[PDB]
């Protein structure tokens, strides 16, 4: 029988004091690194507007260039015949500046406080996109300026990820980490969707706003995370977590490599991100050549892949918990990838009905072990049981496991440009050549993990 | 030590639990009653739609018969020459059953608990109002349908105000004043200022969705109240507040009969501007249909400024009637000057209209506290709960007859001329100033002691 207390208040009463702060931090870390991606996005949207052919527009007065030169509807010095070399030389001066910047940000992230460092690593990321956006509103036509901004936009956005998993690893414990980090990784897709939808508004007109509006949203979130961030549970009298008297000093970069898993899970992720990039480079150069249906959907099937990543994580969390093996799940999910690329290649003769049901499963099998390794394996191998509690190593291990995975994407457009003139099918065999290297590199850790299972189950569970 | 607390956490960890539980209710009651006011506004903003002149109108294919219609751009029981009289048989047919409803709910308002009676009053007042717009899609042309939906909408929507002041009056004292209450009383103006913007979108087009959208938002705020509202602080156990027939036949004491005929005028002034101003701007101003409705929202920022300034001044000057008499005696020179020009660009329809809104809706929210401040001090003391509630019921029951003579009277004075309405709104404003001399004569004697000791 219903009585005097309201249903919403009776539901919200039953949660304890800790389970509201530990849900607050799981919301703020969801907002911050989702506001990073809509800053990273818009140059992959305005890349078809800095050059286009001038054969379908109005002809107001400019009858000088023999009525057609394709030189006036193209804005920048990306105007002449090499609009694919110099325009492609911006996403190398961002990725080199971002994959070098991670191994120094992981060293800086230890010593300085994580509220005066995530704030000054988000205002500068709102400034160095807005200075790029102001190149249209000013009289700017060069080459070195547009790349010297996009280098300094790459040393700044590396303050996001190690500080975020340091702020999350300080609260949660040994328990449901995989199933909660897998649900929590939805920000990498929410940021992509809201970074395409904002920058798609002002792309067919004046293109300065697509870099200024995310550059203001990021700087506003930079002061909200200034005013409401609680890094430690000790400050608000909560309970310290359960990673199974005063502040530990530090750790140096030479000492963090002696943790036994930090090299294999580093080096596998370079190949996992390379697979997940070269597949997305292979898919537009497939459906527009063979299986000619849905030529306009190539800009859509690239993101319906990415949704398959999210369910690729959560299902790869529920298996990682109740087996207590993280290397023995990430290896199997990449064994199952190679019998699904070939079956999609075989089944693409049919239409959309196969090209969704295979694409979702492929996204579940190759963005799974990226998502599980980049946030849950990279936090318990940070606070390993070999540190004896007197070493603060969580913003430095994440830098290694992420700064390998960014080098893994910096070599993406290079190897996808130095084999792609040799046919167009030959880029696909590199994916199968890389999945075998992804699988066979975790062998030592799977060899350790299986003999731990053989003690507790095949013997008969003696002295548990 | 090294990293201190955040400035938004160090600030929020200074407020007591009592302050958060008495802030939650001052937010929830605001968002309840603001959603009651926007169920009432779009019958005022759509009267500029039910009768268009078909002479000045684009005629593509809309001829069902030529030379004998002249009415195709009009709705059917509001198309004749009496379209300004039949709107007063609808808008008064609402405001009658809102008065007879509140005269009864002030007696039989205890047989159900507060939240089960408030959330069954935002759920049937969101149904009987979206039927008024759903009559468009079922396109019935009958005067009989636009009345029973309007007389039953008033009998439900009387469950708003008797069941908010006993939800606040338990938590934040048993009748309090101050600056936080001066902002809480702005809900009756915000519920009109956003009842015009939302319901003005679908006017030039299909006017069914000018009703069904607020009828959905009220019915959804009939669920958040059903799940989150707390009646008494005996349940969550916070700190209790600051503990501080024909009954004599229209009392011969110098209160009731010389005061009751003041709310009857000071509500008749403001409901004419609530139900006939977006037809004033639409008719004899710049000839819009939606912009004329949108310039009606600058009448309801005067209704905020005149609330805030009156609540600020009347506390620090030891008198509440002397901020009502002066602000009623000055609206009458200004409304006449507003009708004098009214058309010379959007310069004098912007700045004159706000200050005409600050001089008539400011003292709309104070002269009901003046009688409760003065008429607790009588030979019938505050211990007589059987009569101190009864005389306030008499005053507020005359106040609800003050609604039903505004839009009824405007709808009859309007077809005989349109300049005449701003003369009835002068003959009703100065008489509001005249019948507060009972309070002013006490106020002068109250200041005489401070002048003698000073
Ligand atoms: O019935 P409404 O027009 O919404 O008025 C609601 C309330 O507004 C103000 O607070 C008045 O001072 C009250 O007397 C009135 O009851």
UniProtKB/Swiss-Prot annotation, chain A:
UniProt keywords, alphabetically: Antiport, Endoplasmic reticulum, Glycoprotein, Membrane, Sugar transport, Transmembrane, Transmembrane helix, Transport
Keyword Membrane appears in the UniProt entry: yes
Biological process per Gene Ontology, one example term: phosphate ion transmembrane transport
Record CDD domains: MFS_SLC37A1_2 (cd17344)
Pfam families per record: MFS_1
GO annotation, cellular component aspect: endoplasmic reticulum membrane; extracellular exosome
Activity regulation behaviour: Inhibited by vanadate but not by chlorogenic acid.
Function: Inorganic phosphate and glucose-6-phosphate antiporter. May transport cytoplasmic glucose-6-phosphate into the lumen of the endoplasmic reticulum and translocate inorganic phosphate into the opposite direction. Independent of a lumenal glucose-6-phosphatase. May not play a role in homeostatic regulation of blood glucose levels.
Record protein name field: Glucose-6-phosphate exchanger SLC37A2
Lineage summary: Eukaryota, Metazoa, Chordata, Craniata, Vertebrata
């Amino acid at each position: 029988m219903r009585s005097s207390l309201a249903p919403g208040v009776w539901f919200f009463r039953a949660f304890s004091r800790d389970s509201w702060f530990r849900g607050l931090i799981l919301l703020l870390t969801f907002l911050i690194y989702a506001c990073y991606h809509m800053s990273r996005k818009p140059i992959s949207i305005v890349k078809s507007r800095l050059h286009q052919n001038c054969s379908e527009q109005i002809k107001p007065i400019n009858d000088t260039h023999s009525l057609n030169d394709t030189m006036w509807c193209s804005w920048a010095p990306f105007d002449k015949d090499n609009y694919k070399e110099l325009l492609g030389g911006v996403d190398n001066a961002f990725l080199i500046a971002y994959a070098i910047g991670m191994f120094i940000s992981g060293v800086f992230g230890e010593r300085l406080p994580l509220r005066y460092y995530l704030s000054a690593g988000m205002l500068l990321s709102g400034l160095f996109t807005s200075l790029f956006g102001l190149g249209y509103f000013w009289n700017i036509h060069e080459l070195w300026y547009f790349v010297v901004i996009q280098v300094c936009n790459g040393l700044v956005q590396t303050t996001g990820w190690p500080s975020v998993v340091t702020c999350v690893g300080n609260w949660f414990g040994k328990g449901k980490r995989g199933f909660i980090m897998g649900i929590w990784n939805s920000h990498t897709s929410v940021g992509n969707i809201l970074g395409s939808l904002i920058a798609g508004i002002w792309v067919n007109g004046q293109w300065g706003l697509s870099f200024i509006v995310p550059g203001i949203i990021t700087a506003v979130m930079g002061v909200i995370t200034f005013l409401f961030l609680i890094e430690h549970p000790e400050d608000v009298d909560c309970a310290p977590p359960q990673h199974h008297c005063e502040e530990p000093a530090a750790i140096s970069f030479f000492g963090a490599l002696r943790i036994p898993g930090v090299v294999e899970f580093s080096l596998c992720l370079l190949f996992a991100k390379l697979v997940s990039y070269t597949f997305l480079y292979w898919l537009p150069l497939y459906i527009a050549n063979v299986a000619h249906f849905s030529a306009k959907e190539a800009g859509d099937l690239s993101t319906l892949f990415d949704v398959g990543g999210i369910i690729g994580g959560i299902v790869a969390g529920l298996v990682s918990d109740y087996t207590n093996g993280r290397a023995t799940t990430c290896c199997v999910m990449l064994i199952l990838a190679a019998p699904m690329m070939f079956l999609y290649n075989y089944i693409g003769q049919d239409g959309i009905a196969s090209s969704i049901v295979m694409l979702i499963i492929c996204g579940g099998l190759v963005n799974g072990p990226y998502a599980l390794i980049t946030t849950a394996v990279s936090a318990d191998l940070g606070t390993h049981k070999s540190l004896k509690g007197n070493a603060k190593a969580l913003s430095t291990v994440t830098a290694i496991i992420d700064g390998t995975g960014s080098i893994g994407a910096a070599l993406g457009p290079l190897l996808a440009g130095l084999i792609s003139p040799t046919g167009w099918n030959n880029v696909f065999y590199m994916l199968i050549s890389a999945d075998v290297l992804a699988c066979l590199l975790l062998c030592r850790l799977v060899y350790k993990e299986i003999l731990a299972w053989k003690v507790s189950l095949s013997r008969g569970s003696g002295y548990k």
